[PDB]
Design a protein around this ligand. Structure first.
Ligand code: 6BX
Ligand code: CA
Ligand code: CA
Length: 536
């Protein structure tokens, strides 16, 4: 059997993450000062007689500084108050910020708040073109619309064209904030990534910065980073001891990139166990993906697929040696999961992730069959198979395993493919297909999403690209509506799904695959998040 030529670049990281020993002295000093700064900051939030604009800016700053997870109660109480008071009487900057912060937190504030800023056409008054802070907040707000917010249809185009026009002459760091925003809006960004940029590039350079907040933000960021580095070392040791690097050399070695993905889903200390479990899964299904894609024969993949469905160590003999390696590791990983959850009495819930893995692997096999037969399905049939092969139903389910307050009813809700999950899956599917179209067309993949789309509708590659973009825009409006209260499950279980969508946007920015090619996109992120501390 002549296998295909391996052409994945090695891990760019070597072992620089394998061993990290926390300096307990520094950690305890940071935590002790953070405790004091946390209380000071709580008192800023609870201060009476604050103006609306002042309150919204405080909340926004604390969120962008990445320290709002300390104040979920306080911030919710305040936004709820603001939501229920309906004092509609402000300027563009405050109105746009009010709208965004309320919507991001699930408060269904009416988009009518923007009507005073528009003419009879629903087009924004061009007289606002010289209000940069208004334009910026409108811009950010434009990204949180649902299907009921067509009044905001023009906001993105309007704010973008005038922000671009104004940017070169703005003072710093406002210029850099505007420029960054035009490239990466806050709502669709990975929170830690935007937080790192905001702290170091913007807030630290603001003449008006609050010193208590800056200090709090730098210490908290660097302390959590210590945890993230301990987690990544622990995960690096686990991966090294699997040695897929050598025994399965055909597969992408990207456990660091997988950790960045898990960090994007949640960064908070309380999700440490959830994070470690998740990254192991992303890493392992990545192995399986490359087994189907870039190594295994048709006959081999059939056997592998059927053994996964049956899920039993007795099936290993029916597999080639190299497939036995990953197959035992997969079964082992889930036994580890059950054991790790045993003391919380939550072992039983692991079955949900297992069934989603089986689903993924079934659809991998279908994808291979199609490729071998040279079959180009209609878009509907393509999607019925390729949505699961994003792995996103699977990763979302996996993300709940370590979350201590996840219940059976939460998994039951997720198992029904709720709308917010479906949207996140679609975004991953259509962005991936837009980015990887030309590469996979050269590899002979006649069953790529874009190809299917072209042949089905009889349209050019350009028009097919656009239709997929539309599906992405539709899906983000669905995610946004999916966050509005009342929510079908607690918000804590929506945020990972939202964050999975963000990860797509961030990983495939400027239409390239940053997971397969981490050097351009992911590498600076990983360095900013997991190598370099923020200089204090
Ligand atoms: O290279 S593609 O195969 O087109 C896209 C893959 O990166 C998708 N998987 C890989 C493993 O991590 C989860 C997503
Ligand atoms: Ca693949
Ligand atoms: Ca793909």
């Amino acid at each position: 059997i002549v296998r295909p030529v391996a052409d994945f670049s090695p891990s760019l990281w070597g072992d620089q993450f394998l061993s990290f020993s926390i300096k307990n002295q520094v950690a305890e000093k940071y935590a002790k000062e953070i405790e004091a700064l946390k209380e000071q900051t709580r008192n800023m939030l609870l201060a009476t007689g604050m103006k609306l604009a002042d309150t919204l800016n405080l909340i926004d700053t604390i969120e962008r500084l990445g320290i709002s997870y300390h104040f979920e109660k306080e911030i919710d109480d305040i936004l709820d108050q603001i939501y229920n008071q309906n004092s509609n009487c402000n300027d563009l900057c405050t109105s746009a910020l009010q709208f965004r912060l309320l919507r991001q937190h699930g408060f269904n504030i009416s988009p009518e708040i923007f009507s005073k800023f528009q003419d009879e056409n629903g087009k924004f008054k061009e007289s606002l073109a010289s209000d940069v802070l208004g334009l910026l907040n409108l811009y950010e707000a434009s990204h949180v619309r649902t299907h009921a917010d067509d009044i905001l249809e023009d906001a993105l185009a309007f704010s973008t064209i005038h922000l671009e026009s104004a940017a070169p002459h703005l003072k710093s760091p406002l210029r850099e904030q505007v420029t960054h925003a035009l490239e990466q809006c806050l709502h669709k960004g990975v929170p830690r990534v935007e937080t790192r940029f905001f702290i170091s590039s913007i807030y630290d350079k603001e003449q008006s910065k609050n010193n208590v907040l800056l200090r709090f933000a730098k210490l908290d960021f660097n302390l959590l980073q210590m945890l993230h580095k301990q987690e990544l070392a622990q995960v690096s040791r686990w991966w090294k001891d699997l040695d897929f690097v050598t025994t399965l050399p055909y597969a992408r070695d990207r456990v660091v990139e997988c950790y960045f993905w898990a960090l994007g889903v949640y960064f908070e200390p309380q999700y440490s166990q959830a994070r470690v479990m998740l990254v192991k899964t992303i890493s392992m299904i990545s192995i399986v993906d490359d087994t189907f894609d870039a190594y295994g024969t048709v006959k081999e993949l059939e056997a592998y697929t059927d053994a996964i469905q049956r899920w039993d160590i007795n099936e290993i003999d029916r597999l080639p040696d190299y497939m036995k390696i990953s197959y035992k590791a997969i079964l082992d990983l889930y036994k580890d999961y059950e054991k790790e959850l045993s003391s919380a009495g939550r072992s039983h819930i692991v079955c949900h992730a297992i069934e989603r893995m089986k689903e993924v692997v079934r659809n991998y096999n279908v994808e291979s069959t199609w490729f071998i037969e040279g079959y180009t399905p209609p878009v509907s049939e393509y999607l019925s198979n390729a949505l699961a092969t994003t792995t996103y139903y699977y990763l979302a389910t996996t993300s709940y395993l370590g979350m201590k307050s996840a219940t059976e009813q939460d998994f039951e809700w997720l198992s029904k493919n709720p709308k917010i999950l479906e949207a996140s899956v679609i975004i991953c599917r259509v962005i991936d297909d837009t980015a990887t179209y030309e590469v996979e067309k050269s590899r002979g993949q006649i069953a790529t999403g874009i190809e299917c789309c072209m042949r089905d509708y009889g349209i050019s590659t350009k028009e097919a690209m656009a239709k997929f973009q539309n599906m992405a825009e539709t899906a983000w409006k669905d995610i946004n509506e999916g966050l509005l209260r009342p929510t079908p499950v607690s918000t804590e279980f929506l945020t990972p799904i939202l964050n999975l969508a963000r990860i797509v946007e961030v990983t495939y920015i400027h239409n390239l695959d940053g997971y397969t090619h981490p050097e351009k996109v992911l590498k600076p992120h990983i360095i900013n998040l997991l190598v370099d501390s923020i200089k204090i």
